[PDB]
Amino acid sequence: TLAVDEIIETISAITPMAQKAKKYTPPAASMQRSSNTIWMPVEQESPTQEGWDLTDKATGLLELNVAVNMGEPDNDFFQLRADDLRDETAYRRRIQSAARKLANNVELKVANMAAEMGSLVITSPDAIGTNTADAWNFVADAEEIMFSRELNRDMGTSYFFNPQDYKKAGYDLTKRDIFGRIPEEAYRDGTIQRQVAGFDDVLRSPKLPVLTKSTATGITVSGAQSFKPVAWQLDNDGNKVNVDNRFATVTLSATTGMKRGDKISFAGVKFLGQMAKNVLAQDATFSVVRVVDGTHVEITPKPVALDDVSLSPEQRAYANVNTSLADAMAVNILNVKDARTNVFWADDAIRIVSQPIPANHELFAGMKTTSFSIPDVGLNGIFATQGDISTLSGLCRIALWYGVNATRPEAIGVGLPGQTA
Template sequence: MTFWKRRGQVAGRQQATELNKSIAQLVNTSGSMYYESNAASGFDFISEGQALMNERQGLKTDRCYILNDRSTQKFGTDLAGRQTLQGRPADTWTTGQIGSNIAEFDVYTGSFLPQVAASSGSTTTTATFSGKPEGGGVSASFIVTNVDYRTADIAVTASAGFAVGDKVTFSNVNAVGLADKTDTGILMTFTVVGIPNGTSVTIFPKPIALGDAGLNITEKAYANVNTQIVSGATMGAVNTTGGRSNLFYDNDAIEVLGGDVPMQLMGEFDGMKVISETMSNGLNMYMVYDSRLDDLRLRYRLFTWYGLTAKDPSRMGVSVSI
């Protein structure tokens, strides 16, 4: 029984690893915040993410910062050599970890973080974009229509120089604080999530401009940029160097949707047995197994169902240490 218990534990860890990889890939390709930094100090590097998130004034719950192994080594070396922080240098010497609650983040290390491809993409827009908040609707015949409020299609001269996952800015379009609409003075970053054709790109999040005269006062309450993307504006990629990613996000920005299936019905067929357990991440894991008396073979399968969505890409970001 110890052997099978260990096999189950290994399978569970592997499924958790796959979930971590899926979340990392989602943040890498969907997160709208981005910066590249050559800071040698872990605090300087991580606090840039804090500044971006605080300036944009998004909903704050629990924040995570996941460093790749090389970034952890770089910043851990800096911390381990310090003598001014009580206890933390010694902890870093022992564990190689930087610690928790740094610049409002719980900091982790992940070997599963993806690469950020370098991009030199640049183009110009061919139309002024006016975006407003949208929701779903219900028709008179009770047909529900859902609207993806996160995306915007931007008309450009040519989209060939860009790829899904590129982080881009538009000239003169700055991020504003969601609560008080203060202009941060920092260009708003967007992520390319689709390339419908050769003359348009789809970006996260939808730019809603405080200075858009076509919006009413209620719609302007959702503004995330100071001014509209106008025709002739320069659109350029900011992931110019690329490299191994580090990820930061608010936990509430990502939704993990678990699935339930009536696997207990398998017990009605050919002597199969079914057990299930809720894992620490809230997902259900199922184990279906059976055996043969004539050759003492035991067969089993472990599995879980889940889906991911970037509920709020404006509270997800990517960084690269260069």
């Protein structure tokens, strides 16, 4: 056998989301003691009172924060067996495939993280090809819901289509019975346009997750609940522990059929204009993050009610929902049919926190270790080899430590076409 020196290349993946994600490297010595977590403050909002005499009406100050942490390493541990009859070129190709797979995994975690805590939900009762300009309507709906909430979009926006809906948009553009520049490009190439409906970057991603439908039905809030913005709370020891502003646990009648990534909306709660506190016409959309216990779930947008009388004015300044939960409001489930998700966000909402693995220390002698810079994704890991002389074998390991964080789940979104019945 003389294996010819040619290679039949098979796969070619692209990682646009991991490339567009901003990457953060906090100090390692501090992170080790702080347990791989770090807190960042949140843009401050202040109350306002109308009147002349305000004796005993002076409010305080409140500044909230979020916490970003890290997960666990991602490896390609593999073995150089002595009884293996394979070539050195094959191990080289395995290292290359390891790099490609690590980049793909980073992109997959980014996509799933965004699609599972995207608070803004833009649903459509029919598919994208059903009506003319339906893809543009779908994109403009997300743009409008992002503008109405007065969410910051200074760094930029992004809208990732799944390939099928991208093809549907291209079909919609090509069947126009008229050719200008946009139809001409949608014909010659596949691209619809780079900027659509106000988004400054509209792409197509092949690794977008599919949000499976939820079997949940007949669910209501059990007990009137009130969530108050706060920066720290007292523990049993008497120490003030910081509170993550991006989570709130609601008590429901039964959390059967709910999972991570489901989108819900209580019947009666409306969005607010954040800064101006003007009631919107769109029902507030929440995303369930974790189903803890059989009667509790964790929703990522904290429903700070405007009409809550239990809120001190500085806390009420952070209101984003017109009313509160009233022990009876039925919660509707926005996702009703399996559908691949188109994902839109603001470019500052998703980040990647990266840490080094100091396997280059003098404590790790014997093994030989170097860095391992992944291209495409802007990440670095370690690559180490060791040799066992008792069995005349060796081991190789490519480790990579990182964690995908969503600092502003209220900015990430999910588009769900064809969610009828």
